Design a protein around this nucleic acid. Structure first.
Lengths: 146, 22, 75, 470, 49, 292, 153
RNA sequence: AGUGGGUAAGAGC
């Protein structure tokens, strides 16, 4: 057929333009910083400074005379038995990852993994197997009460 | 489109050596 | 003896990172005398190491026993 | 294979033989055929399908490129208004072309090249040739042919279209191209042959095979930040289940001498912070670096092992002044977050009104009679048991009322043989509880398996169809 | 070369670097090359000897 | 002239016949010692020889048409050897993307001192999105078939090199003499425009071992005489990277070679990359050798 | 570069902990007025990953002077000596109490700019004396040295 | 212009 010319993806050009944009941004920030940084008798007389120091010394002598919770947990409501209390900790996430800070219990994770593994052992929209597998019950907190 | 390397004798004399370099 | 020989001939962390070459991101050849030599991910961005890969001293270069004997004689 | 080789390239012959070993082409055809069978069996009422049959074909049908036969046959309920044959991306269809009661489906796999990889044109050409071919055998004159270029992962369907078939087939084939066990095997084998990876480098990664190499006279620091930001949640039958944040404890444990360092963090730190997780990570890294700076050079650690993988990045940032201090990740989950479950720790950190740092000796006095390796093994077994039950484990801790925990240390003082008996009882506890959650007998486990369970190994397989390797 | 030469060390370092550049790319070393490298490193660890 | 400041004389340069014979011998021994040798090793040896010759004899190639013919002949020899290595039969329409692809993208990364045209039919790729399969060409430009950039234009002539070096060193002397008075060390900031210009490249001033190198004297003679100690001939027998700096930059050449080939997208279209189903080309790396 | 030459010739801390019949052994916090690790260039392998991580530290802990110092020194050893100045200025606008950031600013910025930065430090922190000594060192004029020292006193 | 340099080996029916 007749195609359409696409933009060429050149990693060298990408790095060069990234460096150029960084340099331009750094120059702009330097100008903006210098905009603020560029706004800053007794300076030479020793006897005048001595007198001023003495007068400041005597002046000093005369003067001396929980509601903060709105995050989510990676568990179901029924996973928590009413008659027991548990400790909920943070879930291990990469620092650079910017997902929601979910809250998690280690014992319930162990139980969920065991039952999931058990489910797999027992097992032994359209196209569910390739969607629910290759493509986590939770509830959010409100003022510390759910 | 043969894939063979052609000799640039008598070729591209409209270009210097310091061009296409910053 | 097998453990010592495996440590001596085993792949080191810096050597393991040396033969890893970053896809797409082209690196300028820092060896004028030979273009066929590169450090790979060693010293290259995206290597997955924030800190520098230290030197495995188990791969230190040392002389033979007979060379040590000859050096001691020539001393 | 369906791959055509133009000129013998012995290296490429070997490579393609290895990639498609163990009859991979036939298995890929089987996987695609069965995925289409399932996706049509799901939508059998909305498409007016009476039934769907997986047509039998020759064992070597996947290689039959000169001719072709039907693989999937669709039986109409009463009548299907087959439209004019067209490409898969052609949304427009002249629906009323011919009525029929069958809809055969053919599936072709090809290894495309640079010049020949346009799968739409290939699909149309193959459909026309096979339909008009006398050697090609098909039940009805109405059907569709789906061609897949594995070398470029390009899928397209050409041919007849009964009502509602185009969107369903488009979505189904997009899903199968995105995810498919046989296709995944093909991708993995190609990646292995080409020897390129999607940024999964090899770094020190503590497992159950190098666990023995840990037991050396070098200085080791296990750093844990699991118990930094945590809350207590309790469920009220009358109202609603509610939470309350509590103090956190960073572990800087040392297996060599049991010098366990607690960084106690008051809840007041998370006052105006909108991202608690990474803040806790950076706080832990800062405290670890400060502790290493505090200690003299001789006692400074050389290996820092973290149970969680979240400390691999921050520590290296805050340990940027200590290059000879290697940091090891731990695939095995050492139960160190459960040490706060000891009655001597949770109360202490919950009534600590200000952040501070405390030292403990997890090996109370055992080092007087056992080496620090045995002390560490016993300690990790005790923590595994405590994380498992925390109730029967407490009972096993004291076998008799004579065993009294003095306030000077944490674990009860017992005789050597009493320690042996408590250890074996705790091992039985752990094995029995693992069997409770895995329906496996204790005797069913082997020595290596029991060691793995104590360390924290698990076995799972949601996609076992990779059994097609065999 | 005196026993108290100011540049007695820089020259040795430069000579060792020049000798070592013979194997900057050699992926494999036989016995002669490894003995040479061992002698170079032993001289580098104890410059005075 | 240094007094009249006029063009009193004209200097015509040429590559010596002995140098051409030596280069041909080097290429011949590269090729004949390739019965059991990886293609990448051969391409790297050829690239090293070519950069040595072109950087040493820049401005002298242009007048030596015999050298141009020898260069393109040897490049064709290398390509023929690689093609024979692939299959024991000469390709009829072999494409240049295999040879002139940078080694990180899986290619051989061979430097071309010649004139190789890329057929337009080799600059088209295809991509499948939800709407369907779309086709892309490399360039909107309506010109002849794409020509890979030639190393010729990516080496600055010696006359320009020396004039630029003199200007840069005068500027550096002025900066140093005006910074001694105000008592500030040159801190890499004002020495950024004049970075890779002077013949004793300014990068050598900022080199890590700039103190211990100052006591290395007579290094050019040692480098020349090194051929009597090492079994391998040194293409850069005349300069030292540490002492003299890097006198050639291939960043622009490889940039324009990636650009001419249609970019990473087209180059990988020529490869099995889309057959690996990798979502992107960014977070990937190679491994030179397998575990076994 | 050393001016003699011619054509032919990090992430620190602030909290330390002292190490010395009970079970609880608390350690008192120790603070240090200065924490200046040398440049120690070449120890960072992934420049981009380290830059991203230090940016994340700066975002998460804006009042941590070691974060700004480490980020600026990483930029400096990288060679981007302008973004290091910008980062230090942002830190000074964010951590006026710690004089280490201001001292790093004086170290990085050229003469007049660093003098103005030290004056801004005096505005924010007129009690610390290290900035005064640094400004005296920068001010080449004997009269300027006298002025800055008398302002300090 | 051109032929080739493009035979997988194996098991008995």
């Amino acid at each position: 057929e007749e195609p359409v010319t696409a933009d060429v993806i050149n990693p060298m050009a990408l790095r060069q333009r990234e460096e150029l944009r960084e340099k331009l941004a750094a120059a702009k920030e330097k100008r903006l910083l210098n905009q603020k940084l560029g706004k800053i008798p007794w300076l030479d007389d020793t006897a005048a400074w001595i007198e001023r120091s003495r007068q400041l010394q005597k002046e000093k002598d005369l003067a001396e005379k929980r509601d903060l919770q709105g995050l989510t947990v990676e568990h179901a409501i029924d996973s928590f038995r009413e008659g027991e209390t548990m400790i909920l900790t943070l879930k291990d996430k990469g620092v650079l990852q910017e997902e929601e800070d979910v809250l998690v219990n280690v014992n319930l994770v162990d139980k969920e993994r065991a039952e999931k593994n058990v489910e797999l052992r027992k097992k032994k929209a359209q196209q569910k197997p390739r969607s629910i597998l290759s493509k986590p019950h939770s509830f959010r907190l409100e003022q510390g009460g759910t | 489109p043969t894939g063979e390397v052609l000799s640039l004798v008598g070729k591209l004399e409209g270009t210097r050596m310091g061009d296409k370099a910053q | 003896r097998y453990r010592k020989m495996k440590e001596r001939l085993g792949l080191t962390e810096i050597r393991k990172q040396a033969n890893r070459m970053s896809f797409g991101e082209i690196e300028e050849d820092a060896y004028q005398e030979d273009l066929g030599f590169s450090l790979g991910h060693l010293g290259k961005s995206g290597s997955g190491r924030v800190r520098q890969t230290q030197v495995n001293e188990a791969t230190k270069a040392r002389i033979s026993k007979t060379l040590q004997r000859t050096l001691q004689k020539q001393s | 294979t369906g791959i055509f080789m133009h000129g013998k390239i012995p290296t490429l012959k070997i490579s393609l033989i290895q990639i498609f070993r163990a009859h991979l082409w036939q298995k890929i055809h089987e996987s695609i055929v069965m995925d289409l069978c399932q996706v049509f069996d799901q939508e059998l009422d909305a498409l007016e399908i009476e039934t769907v049959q997986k047509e039998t074909i020759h064992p070597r049908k996947s290689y039959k490129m000169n001719s072709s036969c039907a693989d999937i046959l669709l039986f109409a309920s009463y009548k299907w208004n087959v439209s004019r044959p067209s490409l898969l991306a052609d949304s427009k269809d002249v629906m009323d072309s011919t009525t029929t009661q069958k809809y055969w489906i053919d599936i072709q796999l090809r290894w495309g090249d640079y010049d020949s990889h346009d799968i739409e044109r290939y699909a149309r050409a193959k459909f026309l040739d096979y339909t008009t071919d006398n050697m090609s055998i098909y039940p009805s004159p109405t059907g569709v042919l789906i061609a897949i270029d594995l070398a470029y992962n390009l899928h397209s369907a050409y041919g007849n279209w009964f009502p509602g078939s185009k969107p369903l087939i488009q979505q189904a084939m997009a899903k199968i191209m995105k995810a498919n066990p046989a296709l995944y095997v093909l991708r993995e084998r190609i990646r292995k042959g080409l020897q390129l990876y999607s940024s999964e480098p090899t770094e020190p990664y503590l497992s159950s095979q190098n666990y023995g190499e840990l037991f050396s006279n070098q200085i080791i620091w296990f750093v844990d930040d699991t118990n930094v930001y945590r809350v207590t949640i309790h469920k009220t039958f009358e109202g609603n289940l509610t939470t309350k944040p509590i103090n956190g404890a960073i572990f800087i444990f040392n297996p060599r001498t049991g010098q366990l360092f607690l960084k106690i963090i008051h809840t007041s730190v998370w006052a105006g912070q909108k991202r608690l997780g990474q803040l806790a990570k950076w706080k832990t890294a800062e405290e670890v670096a400060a502790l290493i700076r505090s200690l003299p050079v001789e006692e400074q650690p050389k290996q820092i092992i973290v149970t969680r993988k979240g400390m691999l990045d921050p520590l290296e940032v805050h340990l940027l002044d200590f290059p000879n201090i290697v940091i090891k990740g731990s695939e095995l989950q050492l139960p160190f977050q459960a040490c706060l479950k000891v009655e001597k720790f949770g109360d202490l950190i919950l009534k600590a009104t200000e952040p501070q740092m405390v030292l403990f000796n997890l090996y109370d006095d055992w080092l007087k009679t056992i080496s620090s390796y045995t002390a560490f093994s016993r300690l990790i077994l005790i923590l595994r048991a405590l994380h498992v039950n925390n109730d029967r484990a407490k009972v096993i801790l004291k076998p008799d009322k004579t065993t009294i925990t003095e306030p000077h240390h944490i674990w009860p003082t017992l005789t050597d043989e009493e320690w042996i008996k408590v250890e074996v009882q705790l091992k039985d506890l752990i094995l029995a509880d693992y069997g409770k959650k895995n329906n496996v007998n204790v005797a069913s486990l082997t020595q290596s398996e029991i060691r793995d369970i104590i360390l924290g190994m698990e076995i799972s397989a949601p996609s076992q169809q990779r059994q097609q390797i065999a | 070369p005196p026993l108290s030469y100011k540049h007695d060390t820089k020259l040795l370092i430069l000579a060792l670097e020049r000798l070592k550049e013979a194997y900057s790319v050699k992926s494999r070393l036989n016995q002669s090359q490894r003995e040479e490298l061992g002698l170079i490193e032993q001289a580098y660890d104890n410059p005075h000897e | 002239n240094e007094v009249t400041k006029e063009r009193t004389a004209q200097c015509f340069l040429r590559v010596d016949d002995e140098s051409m014979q030596r280069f041909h011998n080097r290429v011949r021994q590269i090729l004949m010692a390739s019965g059991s040798t990886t293609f990448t090793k051969i391409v790297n040896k050829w690239n090293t020889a070519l950069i040595g010759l072109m950087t040493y004899f820049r401005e002298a190639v242009v007048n030596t048409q015999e050298l141009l013919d020898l260069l393109v002949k040897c490049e064709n020899k290398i390509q023929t050897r690689i093609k024979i290595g692939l299959n024991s039969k000469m390709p009829s329409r072999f494409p240049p993307v295999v040879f002139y692809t940078p080694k990180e993208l899986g290619g051989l990364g061979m430097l071309s001192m010649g004139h190789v045209l890329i057929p337009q039919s080799d600059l088209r790729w295809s991509k499948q999105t939800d709407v369907g399969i779309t086709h892309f060409r490399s360039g909107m430009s309506h010109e002849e078939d794409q020509l890979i950039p030639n190393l010729y234009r990516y080496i600055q002539p010696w006359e320009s090199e020396f004039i630029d070096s003199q200007r840069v060193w005068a500027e550096y002397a002025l900066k140093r003499q005006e910074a001694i008075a105000q008592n500030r060390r040159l801190t890499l900031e004002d020495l950024e425009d004049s970075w890779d210009r002077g013949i004793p490249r300014i990068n050598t001033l900022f080199q890590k071992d700039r103190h211990t190198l100052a006591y290395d004297k007579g290094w050019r003679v040692r480098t020349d005489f090194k051929q009597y100690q090492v079994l391998k001939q040194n293409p850069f027998w005349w300069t030292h990277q540490r002492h003299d700096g890097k006198l050639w930059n291939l960043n622009n050449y490889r940039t324009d070679m990636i650009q001419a080939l249609g970019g990473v997208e087209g180059i990988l279209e020529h490869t099995l990359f889309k057959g690996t189903y990798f979502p992107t080309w960014e977070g990937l790396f190679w491994e030179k050798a397998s575990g076994f | 570069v050393d001016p003699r030459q011619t054509q032919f010739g990090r992430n620190t801390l602030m909290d330390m902990r002292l190490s010395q019949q009970t079970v609880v052994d608390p350690k008192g916090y120790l603070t240090d007025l200065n924490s200046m690790i040398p440049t120690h260039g070449g120890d960072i392998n992934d420049i981009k990953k380290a830059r991203l991580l230090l940016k994340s530290v700066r975002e998460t802990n804006p009042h941590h002077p070691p974060a700004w110092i480490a980020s600026a020194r990483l930029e400096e050893v990288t060679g981007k000596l302008q973004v290091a100045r910008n980062l230090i200025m942002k830190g000074t606008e964010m951590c006026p109490k710690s004089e280490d950031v201001w001292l790093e600013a004086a170290r990085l910025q050229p003469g007049d700019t660093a003098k103005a930065v030290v004056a801004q430090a005096v505005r924010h922190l007129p009690q610390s004396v290290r900035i005064y000594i640094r400004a005296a060192e920068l001010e080449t004029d004997i009269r300027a040295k006298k002025r800055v020292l008398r302002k300090a006193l």
